From a paper:
Several plasma membrane transporters import proline into the cell, including the [name] ([name]) encoded by the [name] gene. [name] belongs to the SLC6 gene family of amino acid and amine transporters, and the larger Neurotransmitter Sodium Symporter (NSS) superfamily. As with the homologous [name]-B0AT1 complex, the structure is a dimer of heterodimers where homodimerization of [name] is mediated primarily by its neck domain while the [name] and transporter subunits interact via three distinct sets of contacts.
Further classifying the 2:2 [name]-[name] complex data, there are two distinct conformations based on the relative domain orientations within the [name] dimer. This movement between open and closed conformations occurs as a 30° rigid-body rotation around a hinge at residues 612-617 in the loop between peptidase and collectrin-like domains. Further, the branched N-glycan chain at [name]’s Asn690 is rigid and well-ordered in the open conformation, hydrogen bonding with asparagine, aspartate, and glutamate side chains on the peptidase domain’s H6 and beta-hairpin between H4 and H5. These interactions break during the PD’s conformational change, and fewer protein-glycan contacts are present in the closed conformation. Accordingly, the glycan density is weaker in this conformation as the chain becomes more mobile. Without a secondary amino acid substrate, [name] has undergone structural rearrangements that open the transporter’s cytoplasmic gate. Within the [name] map determined in glycine, there is no apparent density for amino acid or chloride, though the binding site is similarly resolved to the pipecolate bound structure.
Numbering used by the authors:
A (entry chain A): 62 to 738
B (entry chain B): 603 to 738
C (entry chain B): 130 to 196
C-alpha cells in the first residue's frame, strides 16, 4: 500500500507539473478547463522545502497526539484512558456530574494544551501556503471546493458560501431554540441543582465529549418512554436474515425506483460477512470504486437494524459511484464534498420508515403507528441532525475567522467560548484561558479536515428527499414518505447522479430540487410535527438562553484592582506574571486558612485558583477548586473567610491598601477609635 | 584523594543561600515559618524569574513553584534554593542570571513578607542604600 | 509505574523495560538524571503515605506478636 500510494503521488505531482503548460485563460472547453483546474492545483508543493517539511511534521505530530492522548484518574494515576475506548464510554454512558466533568476537563487540559502551539504554527503555515496559491487565506482555499465560474447564471463565488450558511442558519435557529429548551428542561430532572432553567447547558452534559451529537442524550430525553421504538432485529433473527439477504433486499429496493442492478463481480468480491479471527480486517463499512467497473463494499455486517441502514447507505454510495462510470477519471466524484453523503443517507432515511418495514415483511401488517411513536422517532432524528448544525456552523465560523486573522492569536478561547455561548447555547463548566486549545481537540480540527461538509450535507439530503417525495406523489408527512416503486423519482435522481463533477453542483441541484442554491425549508417541513409538539410542550418553560450564567458564577469571587490610583506613578504593568503571583497568594491564603482553622493539610497550587473574565480594569472572577478534584469547588463562604484571615499579606504583596484591592463582598474593618479616659 | 566529603553536592555551585530573620525585623506579631510560607517564597522566586526572563531576554518561560528547589532548611530559616528549567531538570539556570533576577525584583519579595533588605539576606546580592543628595 | 518524557508526553516508560535500559546503557548525564528524577518523583510520592501506613500497621502487628 505504501509503495502504491507513493507511486500514485509521484505520478500525480509530475502530471501537475506538466499540466502548467496550458494556461486556463485560453481554454474554452468547460470540461477540459475544469479537468486542468483539478490537475493544476499546486497544494503544499508551492511552499519551500523547510516549510513543507515543518507542515508535514506538525500535522503528523497533531494526529499522533490526538490518537494516543491519555488521561489518568487522579485517584489512581497508574491507570490511564485513551479517547476512543473508555473516555468515550464515560462521556456517553455515565450519569455522574463529577465523573463527566473530570473526563471533559482532563481531556481538554492534557491534549489541548499540547495542541495549542502546534495549531498556531499550522495556522501560520497553511495561511502562507494558501496566500502563495492565490487565495486570501486558508479558509478561502477550503471554500473553493464550492466555487463555480464561467456558467452565466450558475456562478457561485467562494465568499457567497458564508452568506448562504448564515442566512440558512438564521432559519434553523428558531427550531434549535425550542429543542435546546426542551433538552434543558428534561436534563434538569437528571442533574438537579446543576442546570439553571434560564441559563445555558454545561458543556459536558451533552452526551458526548465535544457535544457535536446529542444522540446519547436520547435516553434522558425520550418523550414517551412507555412506548417502545420500532425494532425489527428480532424479526430478522426469527426469519433467519443472515448478512447475505439484507443486501439483496436493498438491491430490490434500489431497482424498484429504476436504478440499475448490481454487477456480477460485486457479490463475488464483497466482504459482506466478517472473516472471523482467522483473517484480520477493518470493520468500518466502506465503499470502494477501484475503477474499470470494479465496485465493492466492506462491512462486518451483523443482524441488526443499524447494519441494515448502513448497508442501504453503502449501496447508495456505490450506486452514486456507478452513476458516473462513463465520466473521465478526474470526474469520477460527486458534485461537491456534500453530495455523496447526502445521496447515501437519503436511502437510509427512506428505508427506516415503518411503511417500508411493513412492506418488506419485517414489521407485522397489523401494526398501527401512534403519533407518540412518530414524536419519539422525530426527536431521535432531531438529536442527531439538528443537534450538530449549530456546533458545525460555530466551529466552521471560528476556523474561518482564525484563518482570516479576524481573531487575534491571544484571543482564541475568549472568542471561541463567547461564540459557543451565543450560538450553540453551551457554557463551559470551568474557565479556559488562552493556554487551552479546546477546538483543536476535535478529530476534524487537529487532522486538517474541512468541517463545513457536514453542514451542507445535512441540508442537501432533505432537499433531495422532499423532491423525491414530490415525484412519488406522497400526501402524508415527510418523515413517512417512501420512494419505493417510484420510477419517476429514480429517474430524477439518476439524472443528477450521472452528472458527477462534469457539471456545477448548482446545476446538479437544479436537476433534482429545481433550485440553484441550498434551502433549509425542507428541514423545517420534515421537523414540523416535532416542532409543534415542542412548542406546545414549552408553554411554561423559558425558551432561549442567556449568555451570562455560568456554573462557576455562584462560587466566584470578583476582584477589582486599581494600581494607578493607589501608586500614581512608578506603577507596574499587570502582565501574566502578576496574575500568577496573585493566584499563588490566593493559594497560600487558602492553605493558611485550611491549616490554622480546620487543621487540614490541603496542598493547593497556583493552578487551583481559576480566573475568568479578565478585563483591562484588572477586574476578574476567581474561584478555588480542590487540589486534584475539579468537580469539587470550595464554597464561597470558606474562601471569603480565608481572604479575611490573610488579606494583609495579599495587600502587601502588591503594595495595595484595601481600596485598590477590592474583593466585592469582603468589607475591611478600619478599627475602633480609642477614647480618652 | 581517597575518600569523600559529605558537603559537596552537584547543585551547590548554582545554589543561592537565603537567611531570614523574622523575629528581629518584626519583633512581636511575627508569623511562623511553616510550609505555606516556603510555598509563598518559592512562588515569589518563580515570579521574579518570570519577570526577568520577560523584561530582559524577552522570553516567555513558564516557571512554577516546583521549579525552585530548596535544600538545607534550618530553624534559622536559612536554606539554599536554585531554579531549574520549567520542564528540563537537567537544565539549571546559572547563578548570575538568578542573581540579576533577584536584584531586579527584590522589592516585591521584600514586601511579600514585610522584610527590608536586612532580615531577607541572599548572601551575594548586596542592596544599594541610595546616593545622598547634596545642597546646591 | 510510568514515566513520560516531557518533550513527548504521549510516550511513557515502565521500569523493567526502557527505563532500566536507559539507566544501564545511556552515557548522557541529562537523560540519566531525567530518568532518575522522574522515577523518584512519579512513584516515590505515590508510595510515601502508603509506606507510612504500612510502617504503622506492621509496627502494631509486631508489637502484638511480642516484638
Ligand atoms: C470531588 O468532590 C465531589 C464533591 O463536589 C465528590 O462528590 C461526592 O462524592 C461522595 C462519595 O460518593 C458522595 O457521597 C455519596 O452520595 C450519594 C448520593 O446518592 C449517596 O447515595 C452516598 O451514600 C454517599 O453519601 C457525595 O454526594 C458527592 N457530592 C457531590 C456534590 O457530588 C467527589 O467524590 C470528589 N471526588 C474525589 C475523587 O474525591
Ligand atoms: C536540558 O538542558 C540541557 C542543558 O543543561 C540540554 O543539554 C544540551 O543539549 C544540546 C542539544 O543536544 C547540546 O548541544 C549539542 O552538544 C553536543 C555535545 O557534543 C554537540 O556535539 C552538538 O553539536 C550540540 O551542540 C548541549 O551540549 C547540551 N548541554 C549540556 C550542558 O548538556 C538538554 O538538551 C535540555 N533538554 C531538553 C529536552 O531541552
Ligand atoms: C470538451 O472535451 C470533451 C472530451 O473530448 C468532449 O466530449 C467528447 O469526448 C469524446 C471522448 O473524449 C470525443 O470523442 C468527442 O469528440 C467529444 N465531443 C463530443 C461532442 O462528443 C466535449 O465535446 C468537448 N466540448 C467542447 C465544447 O469542446
Ligand atoms: C504552481 O507553481 C508553479 C511554480 O512552482 C507556478 O508557475 C504556478 O503559477 C503555480 N500555480 C499553478 C496553478 O500552477
Ligand atoms: C438483478 O439480479 C438478480 C440476481 O442477481 C435478479 O434476480 C434480478 O431479477 C435482477 N434485476 C432485474 C431488474 O432483472
Ligand atoms: C395523538 O393524538 C391524540 C388524539 O387526538 C391526542 O390526544 C394526543 O395528544 C396526540 N399526541 C401527540 C404527541 O400528538
Ligand atoms: C412495491 O412493489 C412490490 C412489488 O410488487 C410490492 O411487493 C410492494 O408491496 C410495493 N410497495 C412497497 C411499499 O414496497
Ligand atoms: C477590624 O475588625 C476586625 C474584627 O472586628 C479585625 O479582624 C480587623 O483586624 C480590624 N481592622 C483593623 C483593626 O484595622
Ligand atoms: C542603589 O543603586 C542601584 C543601582 O546603582 C539601584 O538599582 C537601587 O535601586 C538603589 N537603591 C536605592 C536608591 O534605594
Ligand atoms: Zn458515507
Amino acid at each position: 500500500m505504501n509503495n502504491a500510494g507513493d507511486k500514485w503521488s509521484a505520478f500525480l505531482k509530475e502530471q501537475s507539473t506538466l499540466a502548467q503548460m496550458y494556461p486556463l485563460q485560453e481554454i474554452q472547453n468547460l470540461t477540459v478547463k475544469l479537468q486542468l483546474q483539478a490537475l493544476q492545483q499546486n497544494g503544499s508543493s508551492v511552499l519551500s522545502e523547510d516549510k513543507s517539511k515543518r507542515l508535514n511534521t506538525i500535522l503528523n505530530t497533531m494526529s499522533t497526539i490526538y490518537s494516543t492522548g491519555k488521561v489518568c484518574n487522579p485517584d489512581n494515576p497508574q491507570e490511564c484512558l485513551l479517547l476512543e475506548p473508555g473516555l468515550n464510554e464515560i462521556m456517553a454512558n455515565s450519569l455522574d456530574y463529577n465523573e463527566r466533568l473530570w473526563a471533559w476537563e482532563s481531556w481538554r487540559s492534557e491534549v489541548g494544551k499540547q495542541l495549542r502551539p502546534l495549531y498556531e504554527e499550522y495556522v501560520v503555515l497553511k495561511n502562507e501556503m494558501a496566500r502563495a496559491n492565490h487565495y486570501e487565506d486558508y479558509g478561502d482555499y477550503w471554500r473553493g471546493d464550492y466555487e463555480v465560474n464561467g456558467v452565466d447564471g450558475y456562478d457561485y463565488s467562494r465568499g457567497q458560501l458564508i452568506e448562504d450558511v448564515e442566512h440558512t442558519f438564521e432559519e434553523i435557529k428558531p427550531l434549535y431554540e425550542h429543542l435546546h429548551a426542551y433538552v434543558r428542561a428534561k436534563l434538569m430532572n437528571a442533574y438537579p441543582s446543576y442546570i439553571s432553567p434560564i441559563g445555558c447547558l454545561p458543556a459536558h452534559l451533552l452526551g458526548d465529549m465535544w457535544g457535536r451529537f446529542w444522540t446519547n442524550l436520547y435516553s434522558l430525553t425520550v418523550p414517551f418512554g412507555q412506548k417502545p421504538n420500532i425494532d425489527v432485529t428480532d424479526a430478522m433473527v426469527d426469519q433467519a436474515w443472515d448478512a447475505q439477504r439484507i443486501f439483496k433486499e436493498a438491491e430490490k429496493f434500489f431497482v424498484s425506483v429504476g436504478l440499475p442492478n448490481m454487477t456480477q463481480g460485486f457479490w463475488e468480491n464483497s466482504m459482506l460477512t466478517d472473516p472471523g479471527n482467522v483473517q484480520k480486517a477493518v470493520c468500518h463499512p466502506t465503499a470502494w470504486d477501484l475503477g474499470k467497473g470494479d465496485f465493492r463494499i466492506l462491512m462486518c455486517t451483523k443482524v441488526t437494524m443499524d447494519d441494515f441502514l448502513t448497508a442501504h447507505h453503502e449501496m447508495g454510495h456505490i450506486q452514486y459511484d456507478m452513476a458516473y462510470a462513463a465520466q473521465p477519471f478526474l470526474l469520477r466524484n460527486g458534485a461537491n464534498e456534500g453530495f455523496h453523503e447526502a445521496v447515501g443517507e437519503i436511502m437510509s432515511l427512506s428505508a427506516a420508515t415503518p411503511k417500508h418495514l411493513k412492506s418488506i415483511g419485517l414489521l407485522s401488517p397489523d401494526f398501527q403507528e401512534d403519533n407518540e411513536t412518530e414524536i419519539n422517532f422525530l426527536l431521535k432524528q432531531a438529536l442527531t441532525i439538528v443537534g450538530t448544525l449549530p456546533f458545525t456552523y460555530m466551529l466552521e465560523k471560528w476556523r474561518w475567522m482564525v484563518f482570516k486573522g479576524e481573531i487575534p492569536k491571544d484571543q482564541w478561547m475568549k472568542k471561541w467560548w463567547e461564540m459557543k455561548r451565543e450560538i450553540v447555547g453551551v457554557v463551559e463548566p470551568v474557565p479556559h484561558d488562552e493556554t487551552y486549545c479546546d477546538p483543536a481537540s476535535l478529530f476534524h480540527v487537529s487532522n486538517d479536515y474541512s468541517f463545513i461538509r457536514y453542514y451542507t450535507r445535512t441540508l442537501y439530503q432533505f432537499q433531495f428527499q422532499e423532491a423525491l417525495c414530490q415525484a412519488a406523489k406522497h400526501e402524508g408527512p415527510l418523515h413517512k414518505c417512501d420512494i419505493s416503486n417510484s420510477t419517476e423519482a429514480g429517474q430524477k435522481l439518476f439524472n443528477m447522479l450521472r452528472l458527477g463533477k462534469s457539471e456545477p453542483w448548482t446545476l446538479a441541484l437544479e436537476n433534482v430540487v429545481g433550485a440553484k442554491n441550498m434551502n433549509v425549508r425542507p428541514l423545517l417541513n420534515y421537523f414540523e410535527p416535532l416542532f409543534t409538539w415542542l412548542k406546545d410542550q414549552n408553554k411554561n418553560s423559558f425558551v432561549g438562553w442567556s449568555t451570562d450564567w455560568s456554573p462557576y458564577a455562584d462560587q466566584s469571587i470578583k476582584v477589582r484592582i486599581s494600581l494607578k490610583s493607589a501608586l500614581g506613578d512608578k506603577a507596574y504593568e499587570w502582565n501574566d506574571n502578576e496574575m500568577y503571583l496573585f493566584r499563588s497568594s490566593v493559594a497560600y491564603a487558602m492553605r493558611q486558612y485550611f491549616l490554622k482553622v480546620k487543621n487540614q493539610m490541603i496542598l493547593f497550587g497556583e493552578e487551583d485558583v481559576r480566573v475568568a473574565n479578565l478585563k483591562p480594569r484588572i477586574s476578574f472572577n476567581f474561584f478555588v477548586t480542590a487540589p486534584k478534584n475539579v468537580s469539587d469547588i470550595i464554597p464561597r463562604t470558606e474562601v471569603e473567610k480565608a481572604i479575611r484571615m490573610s488579606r494583609s499579606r495579599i495587600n502587601d504583596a502588591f503594595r495595595l491598601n484595601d481600596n485598590s484591592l477590592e474583593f466585592l463582598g469582603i468589607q475591611p474593618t478600619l478599627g475602633p477609635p480609642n477614647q480618652p479616659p
